[PDB]
Structures are given as C-alpha cells and as structure tokens.
Amino acid sequence: MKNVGFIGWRGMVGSVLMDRMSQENDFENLNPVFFTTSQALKSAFDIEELKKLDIIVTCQGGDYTNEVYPKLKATGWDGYWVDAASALRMKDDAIIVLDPVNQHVISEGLKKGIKTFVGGNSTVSLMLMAIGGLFEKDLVEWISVATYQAASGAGAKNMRELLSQMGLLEQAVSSELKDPASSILDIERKVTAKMRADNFPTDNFGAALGGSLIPWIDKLLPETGQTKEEWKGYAETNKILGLSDNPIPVDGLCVRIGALRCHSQAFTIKLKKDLPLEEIEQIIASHNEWVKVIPNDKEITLRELTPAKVTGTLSVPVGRLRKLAMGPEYLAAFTVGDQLLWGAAEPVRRILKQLVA
Amino acid sequence: MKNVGFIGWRGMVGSVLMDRMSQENDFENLNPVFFTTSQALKSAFDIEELKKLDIIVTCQGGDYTNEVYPKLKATGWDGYWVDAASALRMKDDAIIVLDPVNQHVISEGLKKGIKTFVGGNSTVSLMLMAIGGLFEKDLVEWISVATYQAASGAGAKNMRELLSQMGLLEQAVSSELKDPASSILDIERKVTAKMRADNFPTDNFGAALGGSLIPWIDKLLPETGQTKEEWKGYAETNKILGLSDNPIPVDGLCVRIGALRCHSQAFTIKLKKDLPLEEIEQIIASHNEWVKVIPNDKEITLRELTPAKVTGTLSVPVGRLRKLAMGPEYLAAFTVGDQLLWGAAEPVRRILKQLVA
Ligand SMILES: N[C@@H](CCO)C(=O)O
Ligand SMILES: N[C@@H](CCO)C(=O)O
C-alpha cells in the first residue's frame, strides 16, 4: 500500500484528523509512519526518512512546512504533500482542497502532475460547503460577509482562555445570581469591572472575548485594509473554485466571538438573476449531502442553526433564507459549521483517502 | 415648572434613565411625580391622576402603554407622552426620537402639534449614532447589516441566564483548565455536553447563548421573512430620518451573542458616489460628539472597538472602515454601542430635557 507519513498528528487539528481517520477505518488502506519534532517515531526533520514516503500529511503548521518542504522537494522527492497549514495554498504548483465543492478542480490537478494539496481557510471552506450550489451555477455576483468565529481557529490555548474568562465573569456575581431579587445593574457593573481588571486573563486574544467580541482576526494588509483572514475570502474562494480568470468578489468583516469550535456567518448574497426562494433553497440543499437547509422558522432555527447544535458534527446548516430589501436578487443567509472538521481535518482526510485508493 | 410623571422607573431601562437624570441633575428643572402598578407614589392606572400631568415618561412597556394611553387621550388630556416602548413608534401622531440625528424632525413635530415621542429601536439608534453623517448627506443608497446583539435587549432575566450559562460551562472543566497539560478536545467535549444537557438553563432564550449564538430575535413576519427586529431596520431608520417618501433600504440578520449590554454591528454600506476613505472618515466623525472613528489598526481596534470598552459609556466607536471588493462605492464598517443608553434611556432623557426647558 501507499506509504504515508504523518506530522503534527498530536496537535489539535492533527488529533481531530487521527480520530476521524480511525472512526472511518482509514488506516486499513495505507501504511502509516509517524513523525515527531521531539528529541525525547521518526524525526520530522529527517529529510532522508521523509524522502522514502509516498505521501506526507502535515498538521504541524506553516513554520514547519516552510522549513522542511523546500528541502524535501530539493532532493528530487516526487511524492504528494498534503498540508493543513496556509503556507502553500497560494503557490502555483498547489491546489486548495474541498472535494465536495471542487472535485473537478482536484482531478485535473492530479493529471497536470500537481503533487501539493492544501486544506483551505476555515471560514471560506464552511461558506462553500453551505452555499456551494449557488456557485455551482455561476449564480453569484458577489457576497458580503460578517463572521462569528470560534476560539478554536486561534488555537487550544485560546479556547482555554475563553473558558477561563467565562468562569471569572460568573464568579464575579455568583451569589447575586442565586438571589432572584438582586439588582441586575449591580450584577452588570461587577462583571464589567472584572472583565476590565488587570488580572482578567487576556494574554492569548489581547482582549476579552468572553462577554465581548473582537472585530479583528490575523494581520492587517495595508494594501487593502483587510485583515489576512478577510483577505482569504476573495483569494481562496476563487482558487478553490479555480476562477482566477473570472473572480467572484467576496469581502466582509471577520469577528471573533465566545464560541468554542463552530464558525458562523451572516451573508448578503447578490444573485446574478431574480429567482424564486423555493428554487434557491432547492439548489442549495442539493449541492452536497452535508449542507442542511433550515426552514425560516423560529423554533427550528433555535434548535438547528447554532454552534450548540453543530459542534463536533459534519452537518452544515444554512437558514434565515429570504430576499433582502435591496431587491429580489439580494439573498440573506446564515450558516453554522464546525471549524475543526470541514474547516480543517475533514478536507485533509478526504484528499488523503483519494490519494491512497 | 412642568409636572412630569414617571412610570416603570424601577425597571432596568427606567433605572438607567433615573441614574442618568440624576447624574445630569435633570430633576432640578421639573416637578417629578412617581407612579407604581403595585397595590402594596400614585397609581399608574389612575387616569385622573395622570390627566393632571404635563408630561408622562414611561419605561413600563407596550402592554402598559396600549392599556393606559388610549384611555388618557380619550379624556381630552393634551400633554406629552414620552415612551421607551415600541408600542406607538409607527403611529401617525408620534415621532421616534434620536435628537443628535433627527433634531430637525423633532422640532417640526413640536410645531405640527405632535404630543407623542418614542425612543427608537436600539439597533437602529446605535447605527444612526455611528454613521449618521453618511445619511446626513444622502450618501447612502442602502445598507446590509449583521448584528451581534447583547442580552440586555431581551431583559434582565436574560442577562442573568447568560451569566449562569457561562459559569456552568467553565465549571464543567474547572480542574482541567487549571492543568496546563490537559487535553483540549476532552475539555471541549465536556463543555459541549454540559451546554446540551437538559439541566442547562435555557428557559429565557429558548437556546444556549453562552458559548453559542442565536440567529433569531423577536417574531417572524411571514410577509417578508424577516424577524420583527430585522424589520425595524427599514421601518424605523426611515421614520427617524423622516424619509417615508424616499426610503433607504436597510436589511440584514439580527443575531444574539453572549454580551451583556452592548450591541455591535457589521455593515456593508453601498454609497451613492465614489469618495475618498479619508473624506468618509471625516464625515462620519463630524456628525455628532459621541461617534468615535477608530483607526483601522489592530492594537487600537482591540482596545476601543469592543463591548468591553464601550459598556456603560455614551461613546459610539465605529471602525474597520475601508472599501470593499465589490467596488469603491462599497464601504465596510463595524460599530459598538451600549444598548441601554443611546439604545434606550438616553434618547428618552434628552427629549424630556427639551420638553421641560
Ligand atoms: N477559521 C479559523 C482559522 C483556523 O486556523 C479562525 O477563525 O481562526
Ligand atoms: N436592542 C435590544 C432591544 C431592546 O429592547 C435587543 O437587541 O433586544
């Protein structure tokens, strides 16, 4: 069978990948070799050991990639490189994977001789898994986005920091909350005071997240004023769909909220033509087996369209669908998706599966 | 001096109003009469007692208003009715107040003989206080909105429920969080399990808010598919600006997040003409003394553009300003504002001040 090396399999994303591969019995169809960066398992920095592998799957990160990758291909190695990190997404000899959406793009690359495949930006991937249909019919002129991103996208320590912040806030008024007759503004003043305290743990986010939000993710790109996270919307959406010749505008604001691992997004989709809502809904629900169209009903929306419902599942609900006041060609849409699955580990697991078949 | 009656002054909004009036020494210029609904202070249901007042300020709510209001005006009473509730906002003989934005609209009404003035929708009011300038120059063709609304808009019990939810989530993994070597996915599984537990207190929101979000606020309006909260965007923005003849489209998705009392909003503003960012920024910052333009810089954004910074203050920061990929006439903007102040108590306090001068 194909000899597959795994790097960064112990990290958070790597861990999800390992769990998903086990659940699906993916290890039965390949010969796994595990690497580590520890000096305390082959060495992740042993080029000769990596050179003997047919495929390398890394969830180690960009710094690792930028270091080892060049060296490895510099030895002639002609194997496949599957990466979760963003390091190589924008390279000419690499393809961004999300097979339920761009399978045809993936297949052509395997023929052109493409040997590098990279998982895509979580936000963009979750968007495409939700409204892939609209793009599948060149029905989208542009999309304005507003995200509600989870701590998992930032990292494990960030998730822990969010949780600690939540605890401290409640702890600040634990007794008052138990007293059904206590003043709410008093409670409010105290939690806000704690949130602003110097001892409030905000080292990882650089600001409070629990009980608040942060309208800024990643570095500023002076060229356009977007953060790198927002920049990936236009850049990655079009490379994934392979439309670098007829790019579809995708822009908006990426905001961090206090959710653990599900990214949510509010959309304003300008459609190229006036179409019936019922038809839009059918097109969306038919693109893939994971997207799930939620009726624009309160009770059902509260049960299905939330991080609480989606966390840890492969389901990608999309709802609140209706026409906007700007015109019958303006579509409103809200979606929730797990950041660690379709937003990270899953696309990686699925391309590997293809490569070892 | 003018005889002013106050109803619902003990509730959350009423409490903020009382505090703000005291801080500003507003009681020195009027003769206050306090009412109550308790049978255990005049009776809030004594029409003859209310009839002798020059002005009535109520934060009691819609049910109260719809009950007492008709009866009072049915006796000939020719005084002013200042209300925080939405009950009468859309009546022909009433004006929605937000003086820093529609003072000229307010003045004309006082002449036409308008005797009813109502505070506006929190989200709409906070939007206008932020980007009032753009509207002040008929520079806005339409605006797509995505909100991050606080629990305070729902009520005191909702704020308490959010806080309780946060505590339980952290409590579910308190020890693991203290252990710097513990597994994050283990932590994740436990908090999510608690969030989904039947004993997780979600009676007030009908769903978990802490650690999640709810893409639905208020009742569904079958006619358009919008929730009443989203509906107020178009309805109230234009009545406040008095443009029911040349309405400006305002639509989007209103989502509840785990914040105590600050509403935040991500905007996609389609401008009528191509203008320089620097000029847009100047126009915005000049509309009123409370709006505050935050440089599109990471460090400053994290310190100024958040519920943590704004909570309990009259400041209305607006930042992340830049042009969108859809074109140089597409503006991106993010704002944060306290829901109980400019979103409720302040506009009420300011119109009262005018009426008693
Ligand atoms: N989607 C994640 C990126 C994952 O690394 C985030 O919002 O940070
Ligand atoms: N702006 C508040 C409405 C206040 O009653 C909310 O978002 O619920």
XYZ file of C-alpha atoms and ligand atoms in Angstrom:
730
model
C 0.000 0.000 0.000
C 0.986 3.666 -0.170
C 3.483 4.759 2.485
C 2.049 7.775 4.296
C 3.889 9.904 6.828
C 2.031 11.961 9.426
C 3.407 15.106 11.080
C 1.755 17.216 13.783
C -0.742 14.408 14.439
C -0.664 15.194 18.176
C -1.803 18.811 17.869
C -5.442 19.868 17.996
C -6.114 19.640 14.251
C -3.919 16.557 13.954
C -5.856 14.974 16.819
C -9.187 15.551 15.110
C -7.732 14.109 11.917
C -6.500 10.987 13.739
C -9.882 10.480 15.391
C -11.805 10.907 12.135
C -9.431 8.559 10.294
C -9.885 5.920 12.992
C -13.681 6.262 13.018
C -13.661 5.756 9.254
C -11.055 2.962 9.358
C -8.803 4.953 7.020
C -5.647 3.298 8.330
C -6.600 -0.069 6.834
C -5.851 1.176 3.323
C -2.387 2.636 3.904
C 0.955 2.161 5.686
C 1.326 4.948 8.305
C 4.660 6.275 9.537
C 4.557 8.729 12.439
C 6.999 11.583 12.929
C 7.825 13.877 15.830
C 9.856 17.042 16.472
C 10.757 15.775 19.941
C 14.262 14.590 20.819
C 12.851 12.817 23.856
C 8.508 7.689 15.664
C 10.875 9.163 13.069
C 12.304 12.692 13.169
C 10.086 15.224 11.408
C 13.314 16.915 10.300
C 14.965 13.851 8.742
C 14.729 14.577 5.004
C 16.011 11.146 4.007
C 13.299 9.449 6.082
C 10.633 11.669 4.525
C 12.023 11.069 1.046
C 11.074 7.392 1.217
C 7.383 8.180 1.752
C 4.745 8.313 -0.995
C 2.626 10.916 0.802
C 3.203 13.354 3.647
C 0.259 14.654 5.676
C 1.170 17.564 7.925
C -0.878 19.422 10.523
C 2.341 20.713 12.036
C 1.963 24.247 10.696
C 3.423 26.882 8.409
C 6.814 27.343 10.072
C 7.401 23.598 9.812
C 6.273 23.497 6.195
C 8.342 26.477 5.056
C 11.343 24.801 6.647
C 11.117 21.120 5.624
C 9.114 21.339 2.393
C 11.685 23.224 0.279
C 14.467 20.909 1.449
C 12.467 17.773 0.596
C 11.440 18.785 -2.917
C 15.029 19.974 -3.298
C 16.159 16.342 -3.196
C 14.013 15.258 -6.120
C 11.320 13.624 -3.958
C 8.288 13.150 -6.210
C 5.623 12.315 -3.631
C 2.472 14.121 -2.507
C 2.348 16.787 0.181
C -0.972 17.172 1.996
C -0.955 20.179 4.326
C -3.491 21.814 6.644
C -1.387 24.980 7.045
C -1.910 28.032 4.816
C 1.791 28.271 3.949
C 1.471 26.892 0.400
C -2.171 27.494 -0.546
C -1.305 30.349 -2.904
C 1.525 28.587 -4.747
C 1.150 27.830 -8.458
C 2.016 24.145 -8.058
C -0.531 23.628 -5.267
C -4.293 23.126 -5.101
C -6.627 24.015 -2.237
C -8.850 21.048 -1.454
C -12.552 20.865 -0.576
C -13.647 17.912 -2.737
C -17.402 18.142 -2.186
C -17.049 21.556 -3.820
C -14.075 21.444 -6.204
C -13.608 17.752 -7.017
C -13.286 18.522 -10.739
C -10.547 21.006 -9.855
C -8.757 18.325 -7.838
C -8.958 15.655 -10.557
C -7.468 17.902 -13.244
C -4.607 18.746 -10.921
C -3.766 15.097 -10.336
C -3.332 14.896 -14.105
C -1.396 18.130 -14.601
C 1.013 16.481 -12.177
C 0.057 18.513 -9.107
C 1.723 16.969 -6.049
C 0.778 19.507 -3.361
C -2.729 19.741 -1.884
C -3.682 22.121 0.927
C -6.733 22.411 3.141
C -8.448 25.768 2.808
C -9.278 28.675 5.086
C -11.888 27.506 7.605
C -14.308 30.383 7.026
C -14.164 30.065 3.236
C -14.489 26.262 3.366
C -17.524 26.419 5.648
C -19.113 29.035 3.392
C -18.672 26.902 0.270
C -19.996 23.774 1.967
C -23.086 25.838 2.770
C -23.821 27.746 -0.429
C -21.769 25.715 -2.878
C -24.826 25.269 -5.078
C -25.133 28.966 -5.898
C -21.521 28.970 -7.079
C -22.115 25.681 -8.905
C -24.436 27.615 -11.206
C -22.483 30.857 -11.642
C -25.451 32.449 -9.907
C -23.342 34.573 -7.539
C -22.187 38.084 -8.496
C -20.702 38.850 -5.085
C -21.095 38.155 -1.372
C -20.746 40.398 1.653
C -19.780 38.510 4.799
C -19.989 39.046 8.553
C -18.470 36.191 10.563
C -18.933 34.953 14.161
C -15.724 32.966 14.551
C -14.821 30.493 17.288
C -11.741 30.347 19.509
C -10.603 27.020 18.033
C -9.458 28.841 14.914
C -6.967 30.704 17.091
C -5.698 27.633 18.940
C -6.040 25.424 22.018
C -4.720 27.997 24.498
C -7.243 30.477 23.103
C -10.114 28.047 23.730
C -8.933 27.588 27.318
C -8.602 31.346 27.792
C -12.178 31.897 26.595
C -13.435 29.291 29.056
C -11.455 30.819 31.927
C -12.854 34.247 31.097
C -16.430 32.934 31.198
C -15.857 31.396 34.624
C -14.390 34.553 36.140
C -17.310 36.630 34.857
C -19.912 34.412 36.523
C -17.710 34.006 39.611
C -17.795 37.790 39.978
C -21.520 37.640 40.768
C -22.176 34.021 41.755
C -24.178 34.802 44.896
C -26.140 37.691 43.384
C -27.213 35.446 40.510
C -28.609 32.950 43.018
C -30.660 35.694 44.705
C -33.786 36.059 42.494
C -34.341 39.573 43.860
C -30.893 41.072 43.264
C -30.272 44.151 41.105
C -29.261 43.441 37.508
C -27.336 46.690 37.019
C -25.321 45.876 40.154
C -24.550 42.459 38.645
C -23.703 44.181 35.352
C -21.301 46.677 36.950
C -19.394 43.864 38.691
C -18.961 41.567 35.701
C -17.863 44.523 33.573
C -15.409 45.589 36.292
C -13.919 42.087 36.356
C -13.784 41.988 32.563
C -11.717 45.177 32.698
C -9.493 44.071 35.589
C -5.755 43.689 35.030
C -5.964 40.145 36.396
C -8.551 39.169 33.765
C -6.621 36.664 31.574
C -6.421 38.125 28.071
C -2.870 37.223 27.008
C -3.890 34.980 24.093
C -6.514 37.199 22.461
C -5.063 40.539 23.504
C -8.566 41.448 24.652
C -11.546 39.993 26.480
C -13.569 37.544 24.398
C -15.965 36.060 26.923
C -18.772 38.562 27.415
C -17.447 40.518 24.421
C -16.147 40.163 20.844
C -13.100 41.142 18.776
C -13.671 42.639 15.290
C -10.185 41.689 14.130
C -8.575 38.400 13.130
C -4.962 38.000 11.945
C -2.674 40.693 10.470
C -3.621 43.902 8.688
C -2.837 44.043 4.966
C -2.122 47.771 4.442
C -2.675 47.317 0.704
C -6.445 46.887 1.106
C -7.173 47.492 4.777
C -8.474 43.944 5.216
C -7.069 41.578 7.800
C -5.450 38.470 6.312
C -8.499 36.498 7.447
C -10.830 38.750 5.460
C -8.372 38.739 2.551
C -8.650 34.955 2.200
C -12.317 35.316 1.356
C -11.660 36.613 -2.151
C -8.289 34.918 -2.619
C -9.210 31.400 -1.502
C -12.822 31.229 -2.712
C -11.695 31.777 -6.284
C -8.657 29.486 -6.198
C -10.753 26.686 -4.701
C -13.292 27.171 -7.486
C -10.461 27.819 -9.938
C -11.954 31.086 -11.184
C -8.810 33.234 -11.151
C -9.907 34.375 -14.621
C -13.411 35.477 -13.628
C -13.066 36.111 -9.843
C -16.196 36.464 -7.719
C -15.958 39.274 -5.131
C -16.020 38.035 -1.522
C -15.385 40.561 1.228
C -16.538 41.426 4.731
C -15.619 41.611 8.405
C -14.306 38.634 10.377
C -15.178 38.870 14.059
C -14.231 36.620 16.961
C -16.995 35.729 19.445
C -17.082 33.463 22.501
C -17.794 30.112 20.833
C -15.502 27.094 21.166
C -15.203 25.458 17.721
C -18.044 26.464 15.356
C -17.729 29.373 12.931
C -20.997 31.059 11.940
C -21.557 33.540 9.121
C -24.210 36.069 8.064
C -24.401 36.502 4.283
C -25.737 39.107 1.864
C -25.584 37.316 -1.476
C -26.154 39.342 -4.629
C -27.532 36.866 -7.171
C -26.995 37.387 -10.917
C -30.678 36.768 -11.654
C -34.069 37.034 -9.960
C -35.084 33.551 -8.798
C -37.822 32.035 -6.552
C -36.800 31.455 -2.926
C -38.094 27.881 -3.110
C -35.802 27.284 -6.087
C -32.860 28.891 -4.323
C -33.474 26.630 -1.328
C -33.608 23.519 -3.517
C -30.392 24.433 -5.310
C -28.593 24.969 -2.006
C -29.757 21.732 -0.386
C -28.790 19.705 -3.466
C -25.114 20.656 -3.764
C -23.861 18.158 -1.181
C -25.081 15.706 1.455
C -23.793 17.747 4.402
C -25.460 21.106 3.754
C -28.822 21.306 5.544
C -31.422 23.973 4.682
C -33.160 25.152 7.855
C -36.735 26.476 7.434
C -37.003 30.196 8.246
C -38.958 29.261 11.381
C -38.112 30.382 14.924
C -38.440 27.105 16.826
C -36.487 25.079 14.271
C -33.878 27.810 13.783
C -33.173 27.813 17.528
C -32.715 24.041 17.508
C -30.679 23.625 14.326
C -28.879 26.822 13.315
C -26.422 27.234 16.210
C -22.916 26.275 17.419
C -24.636 24.274 20.187
C -26.297 22.021 17.631
C -23.467 21.757 15.104
C -20.356 21.458 17.291
C -18.496 18.220 16.597
C -20.659 17.166 13.660
C -20.192 17.228 9.882
C -23.543 18.947 9.368
C -23.539 22.375 7.736
C -26.912 24.050 8.339
C -27.851 27.163 6.374
C -31.040 29.099 7.097
C -32.709 32.504 7.507
C -33.037 32.397 3.721
C -35.156 35.159 2.186
C -34.913 38.111 -0.178
C -33.469 41.399 1.083
C -34.957 44.898 0.811
C -32.285 45.930 -1.703
C -34.028 43.784 -4.304
C -35.254 40.272 -5.283
C -31.703 39.490 -6.419
C -30.338 40.045 -2.914
C -30.318 36.914 -0.763
C -29.926 36.695 3.008
C -28.329 33.605 4.549
C -26.891 32.400 7.879
C -24.791 29.262 8.319
C -23.026 27.410 11.140
C -20.190 24.943 10.684
C -17.599 23.144 12.811
C -14.187 24.768 12.299
C -12.086 21.709 13.090
C -13.924 19.366 10.689
C -14.908 20.774 7.278
C -12.863 23.783 8.319
C -9.675 21.769 8.850
C -9.351 17.994 9.330
C -12.037 16.639 7.009
C -10.834 18.071 3.663
C -7.390 16.743 4.572
C -8.723 13.268 5.414
C -10.767 13.143 2.208
C -7.941 14.057 -0.157
C -5.675 11.515 1.530
C -8.342 8.860 1.023
C -8.332 9.663 -2.695
C -4.534 9.553 -2.965
C -4.254 6.102 -1.352
C -7.073 4.473 -3.306
C -42.133 74.054 36.417
C -43.546 71.331 34.175
C -45.243 68.475 36.031
C -43.697 65.209 34.858
C -44.930 61.743 35.748
C -42.634 58.719 35.623
C -43.809 55.133 35.098
C -41.682 51.976 35.073
C -38.793 53.919 36.631
C -37.839 50.860 38.710
C -37.276 48.512 35.769
C -33.916 48.071 34.069
C -34.374 50.791 31.438
C -36.181 53.017 33.926
C -33.304 52.526 36.365
C -30.729 53.617 33.808
C -32.895 56.624 32.997
C -33.150 57.594 36.682
C -29.393 57.275 37.142
C -28.597 59.333 34.041
C -31.121 62.012 35.033
C -29.575 62.243 38.498
C -26.013 62.416 37.153
C -27.100 65.274 34.900
C -29.209 66.973 37.597
C -32.275 66.775 35.346
C -34.677 66.769 38.287
C -33.828 70.367 39.193
C -35.736 71.673 36.178
C -39.012 69.800 36.651
C -41.588 68.585 39.194
C -41.480 64.745 39.269
C -44.423 62.557 40.241
C -43.744 58.833 40.589
C -46.244 56.106 39.774
C -46.425 52.392 40.506
C -48.527 49.382 39.467
C -48.193 47.927 42.963
C -51.109 47.816 45.399
C -48.656 47.292 48.240
C -46.397 57.013 44.680
C -49.588 57.355 42.629
C -51.324 54.503 40.796
C -50.049 54.047 37.247
C -53.635 53.145 36.335
C -55.307 56.254 37.778
C -56.287 58.211 34.654
C -57.398 61.264 36.616
C -54.010 61.471 38.353
C -52.212 61.164 35.017
C -54.501 63.743 33.432
C -53.120 66.469 35.693
C -49.557 65.964 34.436
C -47.898 67.987 31.665
C -45.657 65.118 30.550
C -45.637 61.363 31.074
C -42.394 59.404 30.732
C -42.924 55.653 30.633
C -40.423 52.799 30.582
C -43.170 50.466 31.737
C -43.627 48.773 28.368
C -46.003 48.156 25.490
C -48.769 46.319 27.347
C -48.965 49.201 29.816
C -48.969 51.795 27.053
C -51.618 50.094 24.921
C -53.786 49.936 28.023
C -53.448 53.369 29.680
C -52.544 55.574 26.709
C -55.833 55.270 24.779
C -57.845 55.889 27.946
C -55.840 59.013 28.830
C -56.039 60.701 25.434
C -59.690 59.651 25.462
C -60.305 62.146 28.268
C -59.022 65.132 26.327
C -55.633 65.233 28.088
C -53.381 67.426 25.941
C -49.987 66.654 27.471
C -46.878 64.942 26.109
C -46.267 61.204 26.164
C -42.626 60.109 26.166
C -42.296 56.338 25.791
C -39.392 53.891 25.549
C -41.634 51.031 24.365
C -42.164 50.299 20.658
C -45.955 50.261 21.012
C -46.554 53.664 19.382
C -43.460 54.268 17.242
C -45.320 53.605 13.992
C -48.346 55.797 14.734
C -49.014 58.853 12.565
C -49.282 61.221 15.532
C -45.975 60.061 17.033
C -42.304 60.765 16.352
C -39.340 58.488 17.039
C -36.653 60.432 18.871
C -32.864 60.422 18.488
C -32.128 64.168 18.620
C -28.434 64.073 17.723
C -29.658 62.577 14.450
C -33.175 63.886 13.772
C -33.428 67.107 15.789
C -34.938 68.955 12.814
C -37.558 66.208 12.603
C -38.335 66.656 16.298
C -38.646 70.456 16.127
C -41.125 70.388 13.240
C -43.237 67.893 15.140
C -43.431 70.116 18.203
C -44.947 72.702 15.869
C -47.308 70.403 13.973
C -48.670 69.745 17.453
C -47.082 66.323 17.940
C -47.563 65.254 21.565
C -46.160 61.708 21.458
C -42.424 60.970 21.271
C -40.959 57.459 21.351
C -37.440 56.140 21.771
C -36.310 54.070 18.812
C -35.182 50.506 18.213
C -31.819 50.017 19.939
C -30.038 48.547 16.915
C -31.272 51.268 14.558
C -30.480 54.042 17.060
C -26.941 52.775 17.619
C -26.419 52.509 13.863
C -27.522 56.101 13.251
C -25.393 57.456 16.089
C -22.469 55.756 14.355
C -22.954 56.538 10.671
C -25.393 59.423 10.939
C -23.106 61.562 8.803
C -23.493 59.398 5.705
C -27.267 59.751 5.971
C -26.867 63.466 6.706
C -25.585 63.822 3.149
C -27.944 61.475 1.294
C -24.801 59.496 0.550
C -26.337 56.110 1.410
C -28.128 54.002 -1.221
C -28.602 51.008 1.069
C -27.037 49.119 3.967
C -26.724 45.417 4.675
C -26.475 44.627 8.378
C -25.215 41.777 10.547
C -25.717 42.390 14.272
C -24.057 40.988 17.428
C -26.746 41.829 19.970
C -26.491 41.751 23.758
C -28.725 40.034 26.307
C -29.855 43.343 27.827
C -32.087 43.917 24.820
C -34.012 40.805 25.836
C -34.299 41.715 29.517
C -32.796 41.363 32.993
C -33.604 37.662 33.398
C -31.922 37.038 30.044
C -28.732 38.764 31.221
C -28.722 36.597 34.349
C -29.334 33.457 32.294
C -26.371 34.257 30.035
C -24.138 34.713 33.073
C -25.331 31.452 34.636
C -24.657 29.620 31.382
C -21.087 30.947 31.247
C -20.423 29.760 34.794
C -21.727 26.245 34.194
C -19.590 25.892 31.065
C -16.368 26.743 32.897
C -17.480 24.748 35.951
C -17.733 21.708 33.681
C -13.951 21.734 33.209
C -12.611 23.844 36.081
C -9.866 21.426 37.129
C -8.799 20.510 33.593
C -8.381 24.198 32.774
C -6.017 24.559 35.731
C -3.890 21.649 34.468
C -1.635 23.204 31.767
C -1.112 19.759 30.222
C -4.731 18.637 29.855
C -6.326 17.705 26.521
C -8.277 20.487 24.815
C -10.628 18.174 22.910
C -11.500 16.473 26.211
C -12.283 19.915 27.658
C -14.273 20.711 24.507
C -16.361 17.523 24.679
C -17.315 18.237 28.306
C -18.352 21.865 27.893
C -20.376 20.948 24.804
C -22.009 18.075 26.709
C -22.990 20.456 29.511
C -24.243 23.018 27.004
C -26.533 20.321 25.610
C -27.644 18.972 28.999
C -31.306 19.187 29.986
C -30.284 20.939 33.203
C -28.509 23.703 31.260
C -30.698 26.783 31.983
C -32.109 27.988 28.665
C -35.684 28.943 29.591
C -35.329 32.651 28.759
C -33.592 32.389 25.384
C -35.045 29.052 24.332
C -31.491 28.029 23.474
C -27.952 28.252 24.800
C -26.372 31.680 24.377
C -23.174 31.395 26.378
C -20.661 29.542 24.225
C -23.041 29.912 21.268
C -25.303 32.384 19.427
C -28.921 32.666 18.269
C -29.600 33.924 14.709
C -33.138 34.986 15.581
C -34.576 37.898 17.545
C -38.306 38.554 18.076
C -41.229 37.262 15.967
C -41.242 36.168 12.337
C -43.116 38.429 9.915
C -44.386 35.924 7.307
C -44.929 38.794 4.867
C -41.189 39.288 4.299
C -39.471 36.502 6.210
C -37.692 38.997 8.465
C -37.972 38.882 12.227
C -39.586 41.981 13.739
C -36.128 43.053 14.909
C -34.780 42.965 11.356
C -37.977 44.606 10.095
C -37.377 47.678 12.268
C -34.199 48.397 10.349
C -36.024 49.672 7.274
C -39.158 50.844 9.081
C -37.538 52.825 11.896
C -34.461 54.174 10.094
C -36.662 55.993 7.609
C -39.245 57.280 10.091
C -36.483 58.615 12.342
C -34.971 60.391 9.343
C -38.462 61.197 8.074
C -37.804 59.771 4.612
C -41.022 57.787 4.159
C -41.157 59.359 0.686
C -37.670 58.296 -0.407
C -36.938 55.286 1.886
C -33.379 53.990 2.178
C -33.158 50.168 2.177
C -31.873 48.712 5.464
C -31.946 44.948 5.880
C -29.907 42.130 7.377
C -29.698 39.459 10.061
C -30.002 40.213 13.778
C -28.101 37.709 15.898
C -27.865 37.352 19.665
C -24.400 36.697 21.137
C -23.137 36.371 24.712
C -22.569 40.042 25.561
C -24.287 41.794 28.469
C -25.410 45.247 27.266
C -23.546 46.394 24.121
C -24.912 45.799 20.625
C -22.311 45.585 17.851
C -22.916 45.670 14.103
C -21.017 44.802 10.911
C -22.019 46.999 7.964
C -21.784 46.820 4.177
C -22.719 50.335 3.104
C -23.361 50.981 -0.576
C -22.528 54.656 -1.105
C -24.219 56.680 -3.869
C -20.880 58.056 -5.071
C -17.194 57.138 -5.096
C -15.476 59.074 -2.300
C -12.034 59.037 -0.572
C -11.847 56.955 2.615
C -10.258 59.879 4.460
C -13.251 62.019 3.489
C -15.696 59.318 4.525
C -13.953 59.091 7.897
C -14.118 62.859 8.402
C -17.807 62.988 7.528
C -18.583 60.199 9.988
C -16.617 61.668 12.892
C -18.218 65.092 12.398
C -21.899 64.152 12.666
C -22.020 64.154 16.470
C -19.788 64.377 19.539
C -20.363 60.766 20.608
C -19.372 58.896 17.445
C -15.676 57.960 17.539
C -13.784 56.854 14.406
C -11.326 54.088 15.292
C -8.223 53.803 13.058
C -8.161 50.538 11.081
C -5.261 49.391 13.272
C -5.133 46.122 15.226
C -3.869 47.335 18.602
C -6.245 50.297 18.764
C -9.182 48.287 17.406
C -8.729 45.730 20.196
C -8.727 48.489 22.809
C -11.559 50.660 21.501
C -13.941 48.745 19.234
C -15.448 46.240 21.692
C -18.293 45.742 24.208
C -15.601 45.602 26.921
C -14.530 49.155 26.149
C -17.936 50.688 25.430
C -20.191 49.102 28.067
C -21.781 51.745 30.283
C -20.489 54.718 28.307
C -22.071 57.112 25.804
C -19.253 56.568 23.311
C -20.147 55.101 19.926
C -16.969 53.855 18.225
C -17.032 52.952 14.535
C -14.023 51.412 12.800
C -12.719 48.810 10.335
C -13.530 51.427 7.699
C -12.306 50.639 4.184
C -13.590 49.981 0.680
C -14.965 46.539 -0.190
C -14.047 44.297 -3.133
C -17.451 44.878 -4.746
C -16.328 48.391 -5.643
C -15.050 51.787 -4.366
C -18.661 52.702 -3.568
C -18.968 49.816 -1.111
C -17.976 50.717 2.443
C -17.192 48.345 5.303
C -17.881 49.433 8.882
C -18.105 47.961 12.402
C -19.594 49.753 15.406
C -20.202 49.059 19.100
C -22.736 50.858 21.265
C -24.341 50.485 24.693
C -27.916 49.218 24.291
C -29.310 50.720 27.484
C -28.015 54.259 26.826
C -28.269 55.581 23.252
C -30.246 52.422 22.596
C -32.870 53.192 25.246
C -32.591 55.638 28.165
C -30.584 58.490 26.656
C -32.893 59.496 23.766
C -35.727 59.478 26.301
C -33.805 61.657 28.775
C -32.815 64.105 26.038
C -36.307 64.657 24.652
C -37.649 65.165 28.170
C -34.965 67.781 28.774
C -36.182 69.638 25.686
C -39.846 69.454 26.710
C -39.224 70.917 30.184
C -36.950 73.745 29.069
N -11.218 29.516 10.949
C -10.178 29.650 11.979
C -8.798 29.538 11.331
C -8.099 28.235 11.721
O -6.882 28.207 11.885
C -10.309 31.011 12.665
O -11.394 31.617 12.531
O -9.317 31.419 13.303
N -31.687 46.239 21.116
C -32.379 45.338 22.049
C -33.867 45.687 22.089
C -34.260 46.315 23.428
O -35.360 46.084 23.923
C -32.209 43.891 21.583
O -31.292 43.657 20.766
O -33.005 43.051 22.050
